[PDB]
Amino acid sequence: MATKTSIHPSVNELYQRLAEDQLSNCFDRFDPQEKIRCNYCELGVSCQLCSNGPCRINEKVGATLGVCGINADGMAMRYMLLRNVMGTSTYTYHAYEAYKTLKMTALGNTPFTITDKDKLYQMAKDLELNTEGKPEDVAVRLSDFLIWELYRDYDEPGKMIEVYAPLKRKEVWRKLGIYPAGPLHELKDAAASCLTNVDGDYVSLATKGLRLGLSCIYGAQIGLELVQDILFGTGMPHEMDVDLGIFDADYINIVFNGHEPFVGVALILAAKEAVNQDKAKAAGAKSLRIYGSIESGQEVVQRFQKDEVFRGLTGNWLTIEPMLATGAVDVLAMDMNCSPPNLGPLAEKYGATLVSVSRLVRFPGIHHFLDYKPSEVREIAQKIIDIAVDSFKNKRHGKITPKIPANIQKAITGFTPEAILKALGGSINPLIEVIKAGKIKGAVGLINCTTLKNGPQDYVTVNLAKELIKRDILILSGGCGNHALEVAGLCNLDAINLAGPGLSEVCRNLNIPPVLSFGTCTDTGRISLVVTALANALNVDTADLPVAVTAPMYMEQKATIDALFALAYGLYTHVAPDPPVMGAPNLVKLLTRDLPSITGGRIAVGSDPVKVADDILAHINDRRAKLGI
Amino acid sequence: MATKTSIHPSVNELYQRLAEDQLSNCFDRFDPQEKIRCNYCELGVSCQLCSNGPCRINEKVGATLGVCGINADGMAMRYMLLRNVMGTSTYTYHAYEAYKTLKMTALGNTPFTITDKDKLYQMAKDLELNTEGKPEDVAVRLSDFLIWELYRDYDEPGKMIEVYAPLKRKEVWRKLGIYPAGPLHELKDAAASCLTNVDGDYVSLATKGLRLGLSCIYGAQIGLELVQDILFGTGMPHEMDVDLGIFDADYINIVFNGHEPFVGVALILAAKEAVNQDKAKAAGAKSLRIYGSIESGQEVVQRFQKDEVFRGLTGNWLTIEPMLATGAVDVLAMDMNCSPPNLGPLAEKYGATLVSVSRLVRFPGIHHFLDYKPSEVREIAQKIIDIAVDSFKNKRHGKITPKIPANIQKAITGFTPEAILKALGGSINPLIEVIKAGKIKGAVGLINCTTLKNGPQDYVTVNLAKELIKRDILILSGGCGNHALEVAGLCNLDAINLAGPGLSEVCRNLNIPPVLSFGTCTDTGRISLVVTALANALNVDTADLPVAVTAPMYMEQKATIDALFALAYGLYTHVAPDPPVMGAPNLVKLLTRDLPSITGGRIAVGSDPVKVADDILAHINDRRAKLGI
């Protein structure tokens, strides 16, 4: 088959239905694009930023510079920076909504509550906030402080970066001048820098990308994930069902899909009400069930158990079109990316109702717009259930043939820094000891999307993960790439049998899988808390540790902002497919060869899972040698 | 040669020097790009936003949608929105710095003062601020309030838009749901919407563009321009020297260049110190002179007189490279766009020193980096003078042959709303009356850059302006296109005789030119105050007025954000060259044909000055007919 589909049998089966039904889909749409690809854009040496364009760099024809005078290196890095403004904006958007949700929850106006009060008070103490009064007071103070971190300008020092970053990184960041403003000012400054005839210096633009990455993790991601733990609990390991076989066509099936989990949690709470289960049964369904999709789904499976109501996680963004082709979905409730913009015709064919629950998400053919507001989420969840009941009765039941694949996989979800510490007996020391002894050679943060650019859905990701664990490298996974490993079976105890001799021994002793599900790409900051704890306990810099990062099927700039963060944080950072930079030779040299002498990190490239794994292991072994282990 | 150069003889003379010196320059760089132009990018039907790309729409090869599913209309509007995030970010950056500068001025930490106290107190009254205490206290309160408007979220109502927009527009915006957040949140929301698989609906994306334009004018531009008036005075009409013959090579010559005028004002104040003039003369110069370039220069000529120190405005951004070829510049101090990124080799050849005075501005070969802070601007200005004196002694004097063109033109600069009222005898009535009677058919806001895309520098702008005034249409001008009209002689009293029968006679009686210099593209908000004043005086909506906007040689998205504002504000808005949208037929239909029934405005296109002027006049005459005049 010359069309890239998927490594997953469930997805390939449902692709067959999309193709038989003659519906457009991402897999088929790749092929016409292959007829007319632009290699200037592939290489990052085109520009569309002003009316003297569109420009291309081609020295052979005399087009050495753009009309404005920018060279290839500035051109490529500037467009990378501009796109990374989008990535940072999404994390900043989510953080602000989390903080407003916490405040409105403390004031009594949401269906949520303050669940992890211990985390609330410890965070407040770490940040030197006033902890007098009641938990609701402390929660308002924390929300206002974390909003201040979003809003702080380039000249007001941050506190999150001081609390949560490792000691030896701080001196590097000071030396390089990359301590950022709050993410709102940083992303505005980055966008302004990208306007024509402003910043045309590839080194400066790269520096601004590193700053933007730091602003995203310390100024948005860590705060938002800890606030979500305060609201919904801190994840601990538990068994979850994943893949598209979790659907049963005789129930009313509501799927929540995006990155922000607030609507999903409100849906689970509303679906547990007897009145709503009775509604479903009166409509001819066995009962009402809620399912998670993509990153919003992953946020929930990190913190919530499967039960008779909440059924598990469907898969990553390339599973959404196949999921509709099951003919089992009643409402797909969409809160952020990825909500692909041609779902309308598929929802129509398969008898599903599309509901946007964010002012960000719009595309042709959406049935309902219920933009999120914390004080409205209770009513939003109820209206979604009402829509789903009507949709089941009048659109799907008795009209649509279901075609649900048989595949269901088990994954242990809910790893957090706290869960790792508990699994090790309350101290990081046993992990240090198994690393020093060579049982685990090192650890990889797999923080990733999925894409079709460099293979069938999830091919590189799953095979790279298999190659890493065979080499006794423990994986901490987040993002659509985490969903892939869960569906592939790498996140359960059976997967110990795929690990090498040292890692399989540790996994059996600790009773954990060789791939630890840490959640979403938004959990890059949270994974950094584990690496920071390692660095601080060893009194070594992050750039000295036997670790690496990989985003091996990256798609969008949530992944690349996390990669820029990883570079600033001093790490070997593998990215595939190539970012659009390879036509800019001095930028390539900076990112791949010179950064180890600047931040400590570097970009690595390639899509062959075996070579990528070998190169990661070589870097880990080089770090090990310098540590004497 | 066949190379597009300029309509201005001074620029053509200096281009010859650049070409004979075999130095790269915008004019020559256009020709290689012409060999390899991408028609997909020209039409807005390419996309580089995720790794499944680069994508193209070409139905003839089966490429109907991008891999993700987006159609041509969503693709084109999304990239327009993303680029307009840059435009909004620059205005928001500038506003924030203006507000911090006013605050630090009130606290006594700058070389500036509160010049227009009347305006300070009038704003405080209009915005219902506390006026107790001293003017400095009120200035701090106004600065904090305007910062709040920058930071307001989508769900908190604004006050600037209530005060400074007319009643019928506010009702239209309310009905359409396009009242925006403050510009920081609005630009973050727009950027997040552009991430792959978020907002792929061209109608939604266009709506977001309109919102972004409103947020920019009411949330940043009006506040920043009125704060700059509070600091540096409200412009009134006065004679100014323009074009490149203002240079004299026997003086130490410092040129400030960008959009933010703070460093330029500080330089003028420092150069007026006798000790600094003594330093210049001891170095062998006749004395020390300051000159303005592009939009920062225009802000200064709006509010300051020509004297023995400050000498006038050089021209717009396509004049910067020619200006260096005079061999007369000692320092070029650069604060924002446009600072073209290949000036380094030109500065080296002609013996000029380049100084960046903004963290936004970086490019290869810059000699000194003096990032602006209000509390450091006195030291920055003095350091620049020190650098200039040394550069004159060591790089230029006795080494570089000057080639200064003879051309100097006179322009009347400093028109403001207040200046118009004064010229009319204290009220707007006389202008309304001569419009009603048909002497002046209507008015156009020319808010423009310059570019080479649709002609030699300033060709379309100047010829369009001549055709408009011949048709008895008064022009209020801002931006690089304003600089073009000043240099071409349309902004002095001789230009009265280029106007048609009715407008020439009104201008002769009022002793004003037919093109009124209103400053920068940043003064779109200020122009809207005049258009709003006309709406109220007539008791009609802005969409009913005999007015239009043109950006006839647009370059970057400061101009396009002003055009998006104009559309939201209900106006016929001509833009040339074509924005990168014309491959998206439904988007084109929305912008050019359906918007009149939505906001009242519409996009018009074309670069033929006669046809464009005829079309503007036809619109104005249609509006007149519906008003009964």
Ligand code: SF4
């Ligand atoms: S910014 Fe420079 S390289 Fe990009 S389109 Fe404009 S002239 Fe060309």
Ligand code: SF4
């Ligand atoms: S966002 Fe869609 S159209 Fe753009 S590059 Fe990605 S797949 Fe292609």
Ligand code: SF3
């Ligand atoms: Fe948070 S990872 Fe990047 S692709 Fe869109 S849901 Fe996936």
Ligand code: SF3
């Ligand atoms: Fe403010 S107008 Fe747009 S082009 Fe850059 S200086 Fe000119």
Ligand code: FES
């Ligand atoms: S698609 Fe236009 S330059 Fe690549």
